Amino acid sequence: VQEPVRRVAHIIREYPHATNAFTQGLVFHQGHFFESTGHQGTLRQLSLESAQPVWMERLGNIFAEGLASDGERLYQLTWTEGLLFTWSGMPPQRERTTRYSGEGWGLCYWNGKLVRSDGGTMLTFHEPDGFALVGAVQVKLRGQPVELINELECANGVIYANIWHSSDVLEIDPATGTVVGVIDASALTRAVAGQVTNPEAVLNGIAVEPGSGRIFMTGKLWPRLFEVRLDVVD
């Protein structure tokens, strides 16, 4: 038991993002870059050369939320609807609708399981086929539960998680819920501050590219998505 590692996200490069996209899910999938939005609900494939998506399916009034990939299918939560959409093929088409209890904030895939956050302190673990709960951990930083756990990303042996309305990103051990790292991504929030006005225009959305290990972060309604390098601070 030691101090969580402290890191600072250093902006490597910036790319256009759409200022009308409320980013709730962000993941790489079968060579492409995907985003889930609510208000209005969409699944979109992003270009890094333009804010205009290369492909989008509109979900109407459904408030879509976190988005996970197992390499073959995309899995997409909803906020209070209790709907999980499972997408397959290229372009993705929905092949399954699944009802679940509780709220859907972030989602990622780890060790054959979907890991789900709901804005509380808990990460719950679910079977991809039918979304039955199989386990849970409480997310704890220095032994203390952390509320507001939002978009997820399963990479590098951890779960990366946004904290809603914070510029910190946690690194969580999925076996235990222990926070093993805290990333300061406040340079990203500072970077867009002169351009965003909406109260909900907050850092959210982490995706790691499988083929390159390159790490990307954005925010709701942000004009930019950022590639970051995570530097240890001592």
Ligand X SMILES: CCCCCCCCCC[N+](C)(C)[O-]
Judged by the rule CB under 5 A, the positions of this chain that interact with Ca ion are 26-27, 153, 206-207
How many other CB atoms are found less than 10 A from the CB of residue 75? Answer: 25
Closer residue to ligand X (CB): 16 or 120:
120
Which partner from the list Ca ion, ligand X, none does 105 bind, CB cut-off 5 to 8 Å by kind?
Answer: ligand X
Which partner from the list Ca ion, ligand X, none does 85 bind, CB cut-off 5 to 8 Å by kind?
Answer: none
Q: By beta-carbon distance, which residue lies closest to ligand X?
A: 200
Closer residue to Ca ion (CB): 27 or 172:
27
Which partner from the list Ca ion, ligand X, none does 226 bind, CB cut-off 5 to 8 Å by kind?
Answer: none
Question: What SS3 string covers the chain?
Answer: CCCCEEEEEEEEEEEECCCCCCEEEEEEECCEEEEEECCCCEEEECCCCCCCCCEEEECCCCCEEEEEECCCCEEEEECCCCEEEEEECCCCEEEEEEECCCCCCCEEEECCEEEECCCCCEEEEECCCCCCEEEEEECEECCEECCCEEEEEEECCEEEEEECCCCEEEEECCCCCEEEEEEECHHHHHHHCCCCCCCCCCEEEEEECCCCCCEEEEECCCCEEEEEEEEECC
**Cβ of residue 143: shortest distance to ligand X, in angstroms?**
25
Closer residue to Ca ion (CB): 31 or 143:
31
> Can you tell me the distance from the alpha carbon of 182 to that of 123, in angstroms, rounded to the nearest whole number?
17
Which partner from the list ligand X, Ca ion, none does 227 bind, CB cut-off 5 to 8 Å by kind?
Answer: none
**Cβ of residue 79: shortest distance to ligand X, in angstroms?**
5
Closer residue to Ca ion (CB): 207 or 215:
207
Per-residue buried b or exposed e for 76-103, using 16+ beta carbons within 10 Å of the residue's own CB: bbbbebebbbbbeeeebeeeeebebeeb
**Cβ of residue 80: shortest distance to ligand X, in angstroms?**
8
Binding positions for ligand X, rule: CB under 6 A:
24, 39, 65, 79, 105, 119, 164, 198, 200
**Cβ of residue 14: shortest distance to Ca ion, in angstroms?**
19
**Cβ of residue 65: shortest distance to ligand X, in angstroms?**
6
Closer residue to Ca ion (CB): 169 or 206:
206
**Cβ of residue 26: shortest distance to Ca ion, in angstroms?**
5
Closer residue to ligand X (CB): 39 or 140:
39
Which partner from the list ligand X, Ca ion, none does 27 bind, CB cut-off 5 to 8 Å by kind?
Answer: Ca ion
Which partner from the list Ca ion, ligand X, none does 153 bind, CB cut-off 5 to 8 Å by kind?
Answer: Ca ion
